[PDB]
Amino acid sequence: MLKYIIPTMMLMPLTWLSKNSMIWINTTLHSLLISLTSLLLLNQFGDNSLNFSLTFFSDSLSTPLLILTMWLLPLMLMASQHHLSKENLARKKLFISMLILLQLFLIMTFTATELIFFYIMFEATLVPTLIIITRWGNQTERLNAGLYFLFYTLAGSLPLLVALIYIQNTMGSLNFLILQYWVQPMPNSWSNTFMWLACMMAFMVKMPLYGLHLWLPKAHVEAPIAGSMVLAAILLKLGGYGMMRITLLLNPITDFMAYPFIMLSLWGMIMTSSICLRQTDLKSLIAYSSVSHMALVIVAILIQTPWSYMGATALMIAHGLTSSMLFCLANSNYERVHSRTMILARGLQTLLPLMAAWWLLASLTNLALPPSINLIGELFVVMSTFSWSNITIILMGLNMVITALYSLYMLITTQRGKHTHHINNILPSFTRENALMSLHMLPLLLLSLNPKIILGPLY
Amino acid sequence: GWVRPDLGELSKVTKVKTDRPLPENPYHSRARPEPNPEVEGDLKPARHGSRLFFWTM
């Protein structure tokens, strides 16, 4: 894994001592070469995981998320011009190097053997995102958004460290195998309940669930496209990854104590899918969509079925791709018209004839189109939760109906019916935006052909 | 007779033979409780470096 750590370091002074109007080509080319080399990882077989040290090791949960990170880097590094192409050379290099450093800590975090190391690189992922969204937020409440982001994610995430130190000095080391192969049941006392609530509540903050979800939408509508897509896809699916790893301990008490979180997640999934049906501010619909789908992920993690974990990791990867792409189309329409609203930018079937295909195809991958990976994830979560109880499938299908409703309303609102005929500034679609759309969609369809990769540990 | 002692001959620390024996433990106290076991010998390089969270060797 060091063969993936060290060229991420070496790609950073590349950006500094490449000359003017040549940093772009070198960084894009070399990060795509890193993406091929990342795809060469996929070796993981059968019985064990694979160990790239006593420091690095990869479960089959971590492999598609790692390839997702090293694939979402060059897509973003191309995605983030035309709103900073007029800015300075030094600030431009600082932004690109900040994204490279954020990739580095994400690789650190996904191949974290030890949970202490996982926590350190977790909040190391947390650090540069505040700087990115605050320095290039392009709105007036970016301070409020970054500050809520910071204090929510710390003040939830912080006693997790105390619980991990306690496990460190009551059971020896914190390799995942020796945390495994040794883990003993922890009975229904109260201190065990608070340890569970500390760990699970830190990751509850990170996902988010419904009582803690206003964390998210300000940090997406008041942020640039790079921070938005990395924030949503890699940070929320990293939180889910972390909960998947740490839930191997605390086996008996989750049945006793894990009912109200299931409850808040289900009813807030319904209320969040309802709130993203009537809003303006086009960017925010995808944010509350992400809240709904990760509440579904949380229900899937806290019930403890192998069907549930396969559906959980499939839903994670598919929704990461879909929500990142749909953020990128929203930024494309915002670069067309400086609005951020929804009822203004109408028309766009007549004009921009090719963009309709990407809007429709992204809205259908959000619709749970049936050969796609999104429906595979949602379907296995529905199967596992109907095994959990015979009555909760009503909420799942009602989420399904409202999800199709708001997604297809988001389609037929902005891009259906009549241009407002006072706009007269929109240019035909560049090759860059459609290259980004083709870099989003085509891996999702090619995984829809062969999804034996993205199903996780319990394949 | 009785020659006067010169200045300063009422000095000059003096021997005398006795009959009673010289005493052990004139401070009527108990024995000494415990010595401390002294750590000696050569030392090996440490077992796996630090044995902290990580930073192995």
Coordinates of C-alpha atoms in Angstrom, one line a residue:
Chain A
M1 CA 0.0 0.0 0.0
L2 CA 3.1 2.1 0.3
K3 CA 3.2 1.9 -3.5
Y4 CA 0.0 4.0 -3.3
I5 CA 1.0 6.2 -0.4
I6 CA 4.3 7.5 -1.8
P7 CA 3.3 8.6 -5.4
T8 CA 0.5 10.6 -3.8
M9 CA 3.2 12.4 -1.9
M10 CA 5.3 12.7 -5.1
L11 CA 2.3 14.1 -7.0
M12 CA 2.4 17.2 -4.7
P13 CA 5.7 18.9 -5.7
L14 CA 4.7 18.1 -9.3
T15 CA 2.1 20.8 -8.9
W16 CA 4.6 23.3 -7.5
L17 CA 7.5 22.9 -9.9
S18 CA 5.4 22.5 -13.0
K19 CA 5.3 25.8 -14.9
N20 CA 2.4 28.1 -15.7
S21 CA -0.5 26.5 -17.7
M22 CA 1.2 23.1 -17.4
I23 CA 0.3 22.2 -13.7
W24 CA -3.1 21.1 -15.0
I25 CA -2.1 18.6 -17.6
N26 CA 0.6 17.0 -15.4
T27 CA -1.7 16.6 -12.4
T28 CA -4.6 15.2 -14.4
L29 CA -2.4 12.8 -16.4
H30 CA -0.5 11.6 -13.3
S31 CA -3.6 11.2 -11.1
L32 CA -5.2 9.1 -13.9
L33 CA -2.1 6.9 -14.0
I34 CA -2.5 6.6 -10.2
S35 CA -6.1 5.5 -10.9
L36 CA -4.9 2.6 -13.2
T37 CA -2.3 1.6 -10.6
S38 CA -5.0 1.7 -8.0
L39 CA -7.2 -0.6 -10.1
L40 CA -4.3 -3.1 -10.1
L41 CA -4.9 -3.7 -6.3
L42 CA -7.9 -5.9 -6.7
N43 CA -6.4 -9.2 -5.6
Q44 CA -8.4 -10.0 -2.5
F45 CA -9.3 -13.7 -2.2
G46 CA -11.4 -16.0 -0.1
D47 CA -10.2 -16.8 3.3
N48 CA -8.3 -13.8 4.7
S49 CA -7.9 -10.2 3.9
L50 CA -4.6 -8.9 2.4
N51 CA -1.9 -7.4 4.5
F52 CA 0.1 -4.5 3.2
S53 CA 1.9 -4.3 6.5
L54 CA 1.3 -4.5 10.2
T55 CA 0.5 -0.9 9.3
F56 CA -1.6 -1.3 6.1
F57 CA -4.2 -4.0 5.3
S58 CA -7.2 -4.2 3.0
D59 CA -10.5 -5.9 3.6
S60 CA -12.8 -6.3 0.6
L61 CA -14.9 -3.5 2.1
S62 CA -12.0 -1.1 1.7
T63 CA -11.0 -2.0 -1.9
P64 CA -13.9 -0.5 -3.9
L65 CA -13.9 2.6 -1.6
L66 CA -10.2 3.0 -2.1
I67 CA -10.5 2.7 -5.9
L68 CA -13.5 5.2 -5.6
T69 CA -11.2 7.7 -3.9
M70 CA -8.3 7.4 -6.4
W71 CA -10.9 7.6 -9.2
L72 CA -12.7 10.6 -7.8
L73 CA -9.5 12.6 -7.5
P74 CA -8.8 13.3 -11.2
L75 CA -12.5 13.8 -11.9
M76 CA -12.5 16.5 -9.3
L77 CA -9.2 18.0 -10.2
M78 CA -10.6 18.6 -13.7
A79 CA -14.0 19.5 -12.2
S80 CA -12.7 22.5 -10.3
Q81 CA -11.8 25.1 -12.9
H82 CA -13.9 27.9 -14.5
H83 CA -14.7 29.2 -11.0
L84 CA -11.0 29.6 -10.1
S85 CA -9.4 29.8 -13.5
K86 CA -9.2 33.6 -13.2
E87 CA -7.6 33.4 -9.7
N88 CA -3.9 33.6 -8.9
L89 CA -1.2 31.0 -9.7
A90 CA -0.2 30.6 -6.0
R91 CA -3.8 30.2 -4.7
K92 CA -4.5 27.8 -7.6
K93 CA -1.5 25.6 -6.7
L94 CA -2.5 25.8 -3.0
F95 CA -6.0 24.5 -3.9
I96 CA -4.7 21.6 -6.0
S97 CA -2.2 20.6 -3.4
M98 CA -4.9 20.8 -0.7
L99 CA -7.0 18.3 -2.7
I100 CA -3.9 16.0 -3.1
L101 CA -3.2 16.1 0.7
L102 CA -6.9 15.3 1.3
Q103 CA -6.5 12.3 -1.0
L104 CA -3.5 11.3 1.0
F105 CA -5.3 11.3 4.3
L106 CA -8.2 9.5 2.7
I107 CA -5.9 6.6 1.6
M108 CA -4.4 6.7 5.1
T109 CA -7.9 6.4 6.5
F110 CA -9.2 3.6 4.2
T111 CA -6.2 1.4 4.8
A112 CA -6.1 2.0 8.5
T113 CA -5.1 -1.2 10.4
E114 CA -5.5 0.3 13.8
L115 CA -8.6 2.1 15.1
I116 CA -6.4 4.7 16.8
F117 CA -4.7 5.4 13.4
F118 CA -8.2 5.3 11.9
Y119 CA -9.4 8.1 14.3
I120 CA -6.3 10.2 13.7
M121 CA -6.6 10.0 9.9
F122 CA -10.4 10.4 10.2
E123 CA -10.1 13.9 11.7
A124 CA -7.1 14.5 9.4
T125 CA -9.6 14.1 6.6
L126 CA -11.7 16.5 8.5
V127 CA -9.0 19.3 8.5
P128 CA -8.5 20.5 4.9
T129 CA -12.2 20.5 4.0
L130 CA -13.0 23.5 6.2
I131 CA -10.2 25.4 4.5
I132 CA -11.5 24.5 1.1
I133 CA -15.1 25.4 1.7
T134 CA -14.3 28.5 3.6
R135 CA -11.8 29.9 1.2
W136 CA -13.8 29.1 -2.0
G137 CA -17.4 28.9 -0.7
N138 CA -18.7 31.7 -3.0
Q139 CA -21.6 32.7 -0.7
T140 CA -22.0 34.7 2.5
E141 CA -22.8 31.9 5.0
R142 CA -19.8 29.7 4.2
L143 CA -18.4 30.7 7.6
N144 CA -21.5 29.4 9.3
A145 CA -21.4 26.2 7.2
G146 CA -17.7 25.4 7.9
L147 CA -18.1 26.2 11.6
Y148 CA -21.1 24.0 12.1
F149 CA -19.3 21.3 10.1
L150 CA -16.2 21.6 12.4
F151 CA -18.0 21.6 15.8
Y152 CA -20.6 19.0 14.9
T153 CA -18.0 16.5 13.6
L154 CA -15.5 17.1 16.4
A155 CA -18.0 17.2 19.3
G156 CA -19.7 14.0 18.1
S157 CA -16.4 12.4 17.1
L158 CA -14.4 13.2 20.3
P159 CA -15.3 10.7 23.1
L160 CA -14.8 8.0 20.5
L161 CA -11.1 8.6 21.2
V162 CA -11.6 7.9 24.9
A163 CA -13.5 4.7 24.2
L164 CA -10.8 3.6 21.8
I165 CA -8.1 4.3 24.4
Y166 CA -10.1 2.3 26.9
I167 CA -10.3 -0.7 24.5
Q168 CA -6.6 -0.2 23.8
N169 CA -5.6 -0.7 27.4
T170 CA -8.2 -3.3 28.4
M171 CA -7.7 -5.8 25.6
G172 CA -4.2 -5.2 24.2
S173 CA -3.5 -4.0 20.7
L174 CA -6.0 -2.7 18.1
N175 CA -5.1 -4.5 14.9
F176 CA -8.4 -5.6 13.4
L177 CA -7.4 -9.3 13.6
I178 CA -6.4 -9.2 17.3
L179 CA -9.3 -7.0 18.0
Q180 CA -10.9 -9.9 16.1
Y181 CA -9.9 -13.5 17.1
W182 CA -10.1 -12.3 20.8
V183 CA -13.4 -10.3 21.1
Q184 CA -15.5 -11.3 24.0
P185 CA -19.2 -10.4 24.6
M186 CA -19.9 -7.4 26.7
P187 CA -23.0 -7.7 28.9
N188 CA -25.8 -5.3 29.7
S189 CA -24.1 -3.1 32.2
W190 CA -24.3 0.7 31.9
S191 CA -20.7 1.5 31.2
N192 CA -20.8 -0.8 28.2
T193 CA -23.9 1.0 27.1
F194 CA -22.1 4.4 27.3
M195 CA -19.1 3.0 25.4
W196 CA -21.4 1.8 22.7
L197 CA -23.3 5.1 22.6
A198 CA -20.0 7.1 22.4
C199 CA -18.7 5.1 19.4
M200 CA -21.9 4.7 17.5
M201 CA -23.0 8.3 18.2
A202 CA -19.7 9.6 16.8
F203 CA -20.4 7.8 13.6
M204 CA -24.1 8.8 13.8
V205 CA -22.9 12.4 13.7
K206 CA -20.7 11.5 10.7
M207 CA -23.3 9.8 8.5
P208 CA -25.7 11.9 9.6
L209 CA -28.9 10.6 11.1
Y210 CA -32.0 12.8 11.3
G211 CA -31.5 14.6 14.6
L212 CA -28.0 15.7 13.5
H213 CA -28.4 16.2 9.8
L214 CA -28.5 20.0 9.5
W215 CA -24.7 19.6 9.7
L216 CA -24.8 18.7 6.0
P217 CA -26.9 20.9 3.7
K218 CA -25.2 24.2 4.6
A219 CA -21.9 22.5 3.9
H220 CA -23.1 21.6 0.4
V221 CA -25.0 24.6 -0.7
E222 CA -22.3 27.0 0.6
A223 CA -19.3 25.1 -0.7
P224 CA -17.4 24.7 -4.0
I225 CA -17.9 21.7 -6.2
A226 CA -14.7 20.0 -5.1
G227 CA -15.4 20.2 -1.4
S228 CA -19.1 19.2 -2.0
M229 CA -18.3 16.1 -4.0
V230 CA -15.5 14.9 -1.8
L231 CA -17.5 15.8 1.3
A232 CA -20.6 13.9 0.3
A233 CA -19.1 10.8 -1.4
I234 CA -15.9 10.0 0.4
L235 CA -16.6 11.5 3.9
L236 CA -20.0 9.9 4.4
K237 CA -19.0 6.6 2.9
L238 CA -15.9 6.7 5.0
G239 CA -18.1 7.2 8.1
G240 CA -20.1 4.1 7.0
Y241 CA -16.8 2.2 6.5
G242 CA -15.7 3.1 10.0
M243 CA -19.0 1.9 11.6
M244 CA -18.7 -1.4 9.6
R245 CA -15.3 -1.9 11.1
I246 CA -16.0 -1.0 14.7
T247 CA -19.3 -2.8 15.0
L248 CA -17.5 -6.2 15.3
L249 CA -17.0 -5.6 19.0
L250 CA -20.1 -5.0 21.2
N251 CA -22.1 -8.0 20.0
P252 CA -24.8 -8.7 22.6
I253 CA -25.9 -5.2 23.6
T254 CA -26.7 -3.9 20.2
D255 CA -30.0 -5.9 20.3
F256 CA -30.8 -4.3 23.7
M257 CA -29.8 -0.8 22.9
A258 CA -30.1 -0.3 19.1
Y259 CA -33.8 0.2 18.7
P260 CA -34.2 4.0 19.0
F261 CA -31.4 4.7 16.4
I262 CA -33.2 2.4 13.9
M263 CA -36.4 4.4 14.7
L264 CA -34.9 7.9 14.3
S265 CA -33.2 6.8 11.1
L266 CA -36.4 5.4 9.5
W267 CA -38.8 8.2 10.5
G268 CA -36.2 10.8 9.5
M269 CA -35.6 9.1 6.2
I270 CA -39.2 9.6 5.5
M271 CA -39.3 13.2 6.7
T272 CA -36.1 14.0 4.8
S273 CA -37.4 12.5 1.6
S274 CA -40.5 14.6 2.2
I275 CA -38.6 17.9 2.9
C276 CA -36.5 17.5 -0.4
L277 CA -39.7 17.5 -2.4
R278 CA -40.8 21.1 -2.0
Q279 CA -37.6 23.1 -1.6
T280 CA -36.0 25.6 -3.9
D281 CA -32.1 25.8 -4.0
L282 CA -31.4 23.0 -6.5
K283 CA -28.1 22.1 -4.7
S284 CA -29.9 21.2 -1.5
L285 CA -32.2 18.5 -3.0
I286 CA -29.2 16.2 -3.6
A287 CA -28.0 17.0 0.0
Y288 CA -31.2 15.8 1.6
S289 CA -31.2 12.9 -0.9
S290 CA -27.9 11.9 0.6
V291 CA -29.3 12.2 4.1
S292 CA -32.2 9.9 3.1
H293 CA -29.9 7.3 1.5
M294 CA -27.4 7.3 4.4
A295 CA -30.3 6.9 6.9
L296 CA -31.1 3.8 4.8
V297 CA -27.4 2.8 5.1
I298 CA -27.6 3.3 8.9
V299 CA -30.6 1.0 9.2
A300 CA -28.7 -1.5 7.1
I301 CA -25.6 -1.4 9.3
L302 CA -27.4 -1.6 12.7
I303 CA -29.3 -4.6 11.6
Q304 CA -26.6 -7.3 11.4
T305 CA -27.4 -9.5 8.4
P306 CA -24.8 -10.5 5.7
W307 CA -27.5 -9.5 3.1
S308 CA -27.6 -6.2 4.9
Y309 CA -23.9 -5.6 4.7
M310 CA -23.7 -6.5 1.0
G311 CA -26.6 -4.2 0.3
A312 CA -25.0 -1.5 2.5
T313 CA -21.7 -1.4 0.7
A314 CA -23.4 -1.6 -2.7
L315 CA -25.7 1.3 -1.7
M316 CA -22.7 3.3 -0.4
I317 CA -20.7 3.0 -3.7
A318 CA -23.7 3.6 -6.0
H319 CA -25.0 6.6 -4.1
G320 CA -21.5 8.1 -3.9
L321 CA -21.2 8.0 -7.7
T322 CA -24.8 9.3 -8.3
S323 CA -24.7 12.1 -5.7
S324 CA -21.3 13.3 -6.8
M325 CA -22.4 13.4 -10.5
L326 CA -25.6 15.2 -9.6
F327 CA -23.7 17.8 -7.6
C328 CA -21.6 18.3 -10.7
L329 CA -24.6 18.8 -13.0
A330 CA -26.0 21.3 -10.5
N331 CA -22.8 23.2 -10.6
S332 CA -22.9 23.1 -14.4
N333 CA -26.3 24.7 -14.4
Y334 CA -25.1 27.3 -11.8
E335 CA -22.2 28.2 -14.1
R336 CA -24.8 28.7 -16.9
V337 CA -27.0 31.0 -14.8
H338 CA -25.8 32.7 -11.5
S339 CA -29.0 31.7 -9.7
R340 CA -28.7 28.6 -7.3
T341 CA -32.5 28.6 -7.4
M342 CA -34.8 26.1 -9.2
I343 CA -37.9 27.9 -10.6
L344 CA -35.7 30.3 -12.5
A345 CA -33.5 28.2 -14.8
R346 CA -36.3 26.6 -16.8
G347 CA -36.4 25.3 -20.3
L348 CA -33.1 23.5 -21.3
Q349 CA -34.7 20.8 -23.4
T350 CA -34.7 23.0 -26.5
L351 CA -31.4 24.5 -25.7
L352 CA -28.5 22.2 -24.7
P353 CA -29.8 19.1 -26.4
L354 CA -27.2 16.6 -25.1
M355 CA -27.5 17.6 -21.4
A356 CA -30.9 16.1 -21.2
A357 CA -29.4 12.6 -21.5
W358 CA -27.1 13.1 -18.6
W359 CA -29.8 14.6 -16.4
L360 CA -32.1 11.8 -17.3
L361 CA -29.5 9.1 -16.8
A362 CA -28.4 10.5 -13.4
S363 CA -32.0 10.9 -12.3
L364 CA -32.6 7.3 -13.2
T365 CA -29.6 6.1 -11.3
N366 CA -31.0 8.0 -8.4
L367 CA -34.5 6.5 -9.2
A368 CA -33.2 3.0 -8.5
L369 CA -33.2 1.8 -12.0
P370 CA -33.3 -2.0 -11.7
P371 CA -30.0 -3.2 -13.3
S372 CA -28.1 -0.4 -11.6
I373 CA -26.2 -0.8 -8.4
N374 CA -28.4 1.6 -6.4
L375 CA -31.4 -0.7 -6.7
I376 CA -29.2 -3.7 -5.8
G377 CA -28.2 -2.0 -2.6
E378 CA -31.8 -0.8 -1.7
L379 CA -33.2 -4.2 -2.6
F380 CA -30.9 -6.1 -0.3
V381 CA -31.6 -3.6 2.5
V382 CA -35.3 -4.1 2.0
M383 CA -34.9 -7.9 2.1
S384 CA -32.9 -7.7 5.3
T385 CA -35.2 -5.3 7.0
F386 CA -38.2 -7.4 6.2
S387 CA -36.4 -10.3 7.7
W388 CA -35.9 -8.0 10.7
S389 CA -39.6 -7.2 11.0
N390 CA -42.6 -7.9 8.8
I391 CA -44.1 -4.4 9.1
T392 CA -41.2 -2.0 8.4
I393 CA -41.4 -2.6 4.6
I394 CA -44.1 0.0 4.4
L395 CA -41.6 2.7 5.3
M396 CA -39.1 1.4 2.8
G397 CA -41.6 1.4 -0.1
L398 CA -42.9 4.8 0.9
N399 CA -39.3 6.1 0.8
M400 CA -39.2 4.4 -2.6
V401 CA -42.3 6.3 -3.9
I402 CA -41.3 9.7 -2.5
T403 CA -37.7 9.2 -3.8
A404 CA -38.9 8.5 -7.3
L405 CA -41.3 11.5 -6.9
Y406 CA -38.8 14.1 -5.9
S407 CA -36.0 12.9 -8.2
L408 CA -38.2 13.0 -11.2
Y409 CA -39.7 16.3 -10.1
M410 CA -36.1 17.6 -10.0
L411 CA -35.8 16.4 -13.5
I412 CA -39.0 17.9 -14.9
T413 CA -38.7 21.2 -13.0
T414 CA -35.4 22.6 -14.3
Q415 CA -35.2 20.9 -17.6
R416 CA -38.8 20.6 -19.0
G417 CA -41.2 22.8 -20.8
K418 CA -40.4 26.5 -21.5
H419 CA -37.3 28.7 -21.4
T420 CA -38.0 31.9 -19.6
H421 CA -36.8 33.9 -22.7
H422 CA -35.0 36.6 -20.7
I423 CA -31.8 34.6 -20.0
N424 CA -29.9 34.9 -23.3
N425 CA -26.4 34.2 -21.9
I426 CA -26.1 30.4 -21.9
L427 CA -23.5 28.9 -24.2
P428 CA -23.6 25.4 -25.7
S429 CA -22.2 22.6 -23.6
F430 CA -18.4 22.3 -23.4
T431 CA -16.5 19.2 -23.9
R432 CA -15.2 19.4 -20.3
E433 CA -18.6 19.0 -18.6
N434 CA -19.6 16.1 -20.8
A435 CA -16.2 14.4 -20.3
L436 CA -17.0 14.7 -16.5
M437 CA -20.4 13.2 -17.0
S438 CA -18.9 10.3 -19.0
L439 CA -16.3 9.8 -16.3
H440 CA -19.1 9.5 -13.8
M441 CA -21.7 7.3 -15.6
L442 CA -19.6 4.7 -17.4
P443 CA -18.0 3.1 -14.3
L444 CA -21.5 2.8 -12.8
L445 CA -22.9 0.9 -15.8
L446 CA -19.8 -1.2 -16.1
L447 CA -20.2 -2.2 -12.5
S448 CA -23.9 -2.9 -13.2
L449 CA -22.6 -5.5 -15.7
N450 CA -20.4 -7.2 -13.1
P451 CA -21.1 -6.2 -9.4
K452 CA -19.1 -9.0 -7.8
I453 CA -16.4 -6.4 -7.0
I454 CA -18.5 -4.0 -4.9
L455 CA -20.2 -6.5 -2.7
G456 CA -18.1 -6.4 0.4
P457 CA -16.8 -8.9 3.0
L458 CA -19.7 -11.3 3.0
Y459 CA -19.6 -12.2 -0.7
Chain B
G1 CA 55.8 18.9 93.1
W2 CA 52.8 19.1 90.6
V3 CA 54.3 20.8 87.5
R4 CA 51.8 23.3 86.0
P5 CA 50.5 22.1 82.6
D6 CA 51.8 24.2 79.7
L7 CA 49.6 26.1 77.4
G8 CA 47.9 24.4 75.8
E9 CA 48.6 20.9 77.2
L10 CA 45.1 20.4 78.5
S11 CA 44.3 19.4 74.9
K12 CA 45.9 16.7 72.8
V13 CA 43.4 13.8 72.5
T14 CA 44.2 11.0 74.8
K15 CA 44.1 7.2 74.9
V16 CA 42.9 5.2 77.9
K17 CA 42.5 1.5 78.5
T18 CA 39.2 0.2 79.9
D19 CA 37.5 -2.9 81.4
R20 CA 34.0 -2.7 80.0
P21 CA 33.6 -3.7 76.3
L22 CA 32.9 -1.3 73.4
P23 CA 29.1 -1.5 72.6
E24 CA 27.2 -2.4 69.5
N25 CA 23.9 -0.5 68.6
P26 CA 24.1 2.2 71.3
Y27 CA 21.1 3.8 69.7
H28 CA 18.6 1.2 70.9
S29 CA 16.8 0.7 67.6
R30 CA 15.6 -2.1 65.4
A31 CA 17.5 -3.7 62.5
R32 CA 17.5 -2.3 58.9
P33 CA 14.2 -3.3 57.2
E34 CA 15.0 -4.3 53.6
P35 CA 17.7 -3.6 51.0
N36 CA 16.6 -2.7 47.5
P37 CA 17.1 -5.4 44.8
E38 CA 19.7 -3.9 42.6
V39 CA 19.1 -4.1 38.8
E40 CA 22.3 -5.0 37.1
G41 CA 23.5 -6.8 34.0
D42 CA 23.7 -5.9 30.3
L43 CA 20.6 -4.7 28.4
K44 CA 19.1 -6.0 25.1
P45 CA 17.5 -3.9 22.4
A46 CA 13.9 -3.2 23.2
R47 CA 11.0 -5.6 22.4
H48 CA 9.5 -4.3 19.1
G49 CA 10.6 -0.8 19.7
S50 CA 8.1 1.4 21.5
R51 CA 5.0 -0.9 22.0
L52 CA 2.9 2.3 21.8
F53 CA -0.2 2.4 19.5
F54 CA 2.0 2.1 16.4
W55 CA 5.5 3.4 15.3
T56 CA 6.7 -0.2 15.5
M57 CA 10.5 0.0 15.7

